[PDB]
Write a protein that binds this ligand. Sequence first.
Ligand SMILES: Nc1nc2c(ncn2[C@@H]2O[C@H](COP(=O)(O)OP(=O)(O)OP(=O)(O)O)[C@@H](O)[C@H]2O)c(=O)[nH]1
Ligand SMILES: Nc1nc2c(ncn2[C@@H]2O[C@H](COP(=O)(O)OP(=O)(O)O)[C@@H](O)[C@H]2O)c(=O)[nH]1
Ligand SMILES: [Mg+2]
Ligand SMILES: [Mg+2]
Lengths: 351, 160, 171
Amino acid sequence: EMSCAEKLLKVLSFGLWNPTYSRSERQSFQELLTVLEPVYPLPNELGRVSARFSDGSSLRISVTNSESIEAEIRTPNNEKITVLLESNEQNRLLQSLPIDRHMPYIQVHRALSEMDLTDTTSMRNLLGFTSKLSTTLIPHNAQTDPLSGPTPFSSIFMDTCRGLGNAKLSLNGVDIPANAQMLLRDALGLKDTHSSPTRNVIDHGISRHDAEQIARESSGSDKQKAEVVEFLCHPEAATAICSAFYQSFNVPALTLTHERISKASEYNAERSLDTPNACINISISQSSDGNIYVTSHTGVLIMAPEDRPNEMGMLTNRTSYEVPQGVKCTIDEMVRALQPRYAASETYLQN
Amino acid sequence: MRILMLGLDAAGKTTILYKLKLGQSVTTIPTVGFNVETVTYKNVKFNVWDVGGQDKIRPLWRHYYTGTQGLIFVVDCADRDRIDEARQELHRIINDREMRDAIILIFANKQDLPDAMKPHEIQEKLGLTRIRDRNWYVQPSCATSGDGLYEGLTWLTSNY
Amino acid sequence: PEYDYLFKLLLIGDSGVGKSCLLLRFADDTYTESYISTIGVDFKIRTIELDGKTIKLQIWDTAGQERFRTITSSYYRGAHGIIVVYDVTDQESFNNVKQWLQEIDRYASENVNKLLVGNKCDLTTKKVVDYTTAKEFADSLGIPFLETSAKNATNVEQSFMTMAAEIKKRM
Ligand SMILES: Nc1nc2c(ncn2[C@@H]2O[C@H](COP(=O)(O)OP(=O)(O)OP(=O)(O)O)[C@@H](O)[C@H]2O)c(=O)[nH]1
Ligand SMILES: Nc1nc2c(ncn2[C@@H]2O[C@H](COP(=O)(O)OP(=O)(O)O)[C@@H](O)[C@H]2O)c(=O)[nH]1
Ligand SMILES: [Mg+2]
Ligand SMILES: [Mg+2]
């Protein structure tokens, strides 16, 4: 009766990339790793991850700057179990965790057993995964800073209209399906690509009416749903959701591999590979402390380096930041208050 | 062997250091601090110390002069506008008594680019030709592949 | 070489004014918002037939956010045309049409075929740019301005082939 959380922690500890898995089991793992949602990390931490499984269990992995991996779990019978972990070139543990690290080069990861790149669906299914892997903190100068220049956070609202209902959202592990997002897109008063959130939605957030609905149409226990309601009621929440969809957050990483990114676009335009431009996978979590953390990584097909020809993969430009308690959904405050951390990573198919 | 990698920014140092440590090429990022790895080629271990080349952290190169067995000065064969700026630093490096005595390997990186600059040219440009009473070599290389990167190593080995 | 021509078209303009909707309706004859904002540069292809010649196309789409300015410049190089699109419902996007033209000079070739386009004309109720107001700045510079719509497919085929011919003149 090994608790759900205990399973994942056991796997990641032995090697999520261990080739000995009968593949049948890979499926068994993907379902768990996709439940890991990056949350507000503590001062002396470099990355915190949380996950609330269906067996009532829970996992909480921490990573100090000293790259120390401490973990805590809670079986269905609330049995606080703390387990200290270690990562080696064998299990590549520190890799299968959504944590931006200091690397001299963009991190490179390999997909699992079957994940293939063909249609729109096949793209999302991959991003769901890579977004749960490490990345490389990419520096940004005043000239490439997504919050500098003439018009900072200008398309933050329009970027959301064509975003919601077409992205993989998550609020405290509670997956937000398509119809769910479309409901939010309404409460946010984002009709056409020219409108802005109602003056009321900014000072008070999403009305308790629409908000409560969005929850009902979302995967999660009744207990969990209620949480999503208390979140979508604060003015801050609005600023967190509309910002995560920003399109320029990709500048920091793109200006690094935009060249190889186009080479991938060419190999597809000719191959008629029916695949969208990019995909967005957002993860917003609000700690019981009150802090609001928003992690929005975008996906984009990219061509492998020179040494490895005709091998396509996907770049995962991640952007994590905190939402100060007070920051309201206005093009202005969003620019003065928020300090996003940008980091991407290249993932190539197993071929 | 304690090797010290230096050179102007965007010259392609980190691209080289980690090109040997991994064999495969990676998308290097602007070095703000200093990368130090350990590669073993020709049955000999190398201790490369890639230091940033930003116009700012240029003066911190002296804090690495002492204890240097060899100097690998990477040069962008295409950035002619700053090709001179190279001999400026290079000379200032190989002069300081600290490193007044060490083998000097100059990498002619980016030989793949059109505006490529032939070795014998960089040799006279950097001002290595006139300066004697010292051991050096101009090895042609391309970090994005690995050409010369290993031969440049075999050089340090034979010349020491 | 099964094709007679190889032309590269670039689409620049304020973000949000349908440079993708005009690139999809022309390449795939479709329109929907189920797509997320373009991140960087998109690449599509659509072969046509004009003057009895196989005119294979290579359209390059680019983001609009001011931040993607520096990264997009690396695409104005081998450009045979530049469709500076602007929203005829958003006055702002109409003024910047002049700025996008400047970027073209600094980066795109001196002899790049400039083709102006006012998209999203179906929403006449919320429109702000008279066919005359725009045509003025357009005809003032030798820019074949045409009002199109990726939703009604109005002049989508027309205003696009206009470049396919305007280019065949220099060749
Ligand atoms: N085209 C081309 N690019 C190269 C070549 N070698 C390296 N590069 C690129 O040069 C750029 C900078 O490489 P780095 O090694 O980071 O330069 P650096 O001087 O070590 O960086 P700092 O030390 O931080 O200044 C990267 O994009 C490398 O991939 C080459 O041979 N040809
Ligand atoms: N009603 C209407 N909306 C349009 C039309 N063309 C574009 N749009 C709007 O523009 C959005 C997508 O245009 P988009 O491609 O993202 O602009 P781009 O990012 O600058 O290329 C959609 O959400 C539409 O609401 C049109 O012909 N009619
Ligand atoms: Mg470097
Ligand atoms: Mg677009």
